[PDB]
Design a protein around this ligand. Structure first.
Ligand SMILES: [Ca+2]
Ligand SMILES: [Ca+2]
Ligand SMILES: [Ca+2]
Ligand SMILES: [Ca+2]
Lengths: 77, 59, 30, 65
């Protein structure tokens, strides 16, 4: 009977020790996720502004092609 | 029953670690993905800025 | 309290999977 | 034992709080990407429209020769 109780306790202990080690690993995995997540938001913010510049640049081209077309209309071509 | 609740608690800890790990892997994939696209957008921004200059000089 | 975490994490997972799908789409547009 | 249980409890409390931030970050991410995807769609459209008008202007011009 003493052997059985001791075996159970030692199993509880060791299973609990592994659950602790798991929570420690959880902690590294969420910390790193946060950093990746933050990095992603910064890159997206930078790229947001880059896409704004590109769109503006497509609008620029657009208006100059209206100048080119008005010139062609004026020259009968 | 004390051991019993440790045993089932343990299983759920492991289940929770698996999800967290999956979540971490997505957050890493996302950042790689967005970083990569950072570089495709650099070239597009460059190609566009020069097309702007071209069209402007030609008109 | 353990249970509230498992479900909380699986929600973010679902959200990050949709997000990653949009970015594979954004990868295709570039 | 109680130093192990207490640590396991602080760890999980801490993971949880951080899961809450990750959710908030994932949602903002999703929104910013939806907005940039629409913007990319207007860029593609405008680039193709720009290229048609470029090709057309040139073709009209090539008749001048
Ligand atoms: Ca035995
Ligand atoms: Ca034994
Ligand atoms: Ca860049
Ligand atoms: Ca670069």
């Amino acid at each position: 009977m003493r052997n059985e109780l001791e075996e159970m306790q030692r199993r509880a202990d060791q299973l609990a020790d592994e659950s602790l080690e798991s929570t420690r690993r959880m902690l590294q995995l969420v910390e790193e996720s946060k950093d990746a997540g933050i990095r992603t938001l910064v890159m997206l913010d930078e790229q947001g502004e880059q896409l704004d510049r590109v769109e503006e640049g497509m609008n620029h081209i657009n208006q100059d092609m209206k100048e080119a077309e008005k010139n062609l209309k004026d020259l009968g071509w | 029953s004390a051991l019993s609740e440790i045993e089932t608690r343990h299983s759920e800890i492991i289940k929770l670690e698996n999800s967290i790990r999956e979540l971490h892997d997505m957050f890493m994939d996302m950042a790689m993905l967005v970083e990569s696209q950072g570089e495709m957008i650099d070239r597009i921004e460059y190609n566009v800025e020069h097309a702007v200059d071209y069209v402007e000089r030609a008109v | 309290r353990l249970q509230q975490t498992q479900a909380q994490v699986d929600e973010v997972v679902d959200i990050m999977r949709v997000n990653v799908d949009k970015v594979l789409e954004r990868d295709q547009k570039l | 034992g109680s130093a192990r249980e207490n640590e396991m409890d602080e760890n999980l409390e801490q993971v949880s709080g951080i899961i809450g931030n990750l959710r908030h970050m994932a949602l903002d991410m999703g929104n910013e990407i939806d907005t940039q995807n629409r913007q990319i769609d207007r860029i593609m459209e405008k680039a193709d429209s720009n290229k048609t008008r470029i090709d057309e202007a040139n073709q009209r011009a090539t008749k001048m020769l």
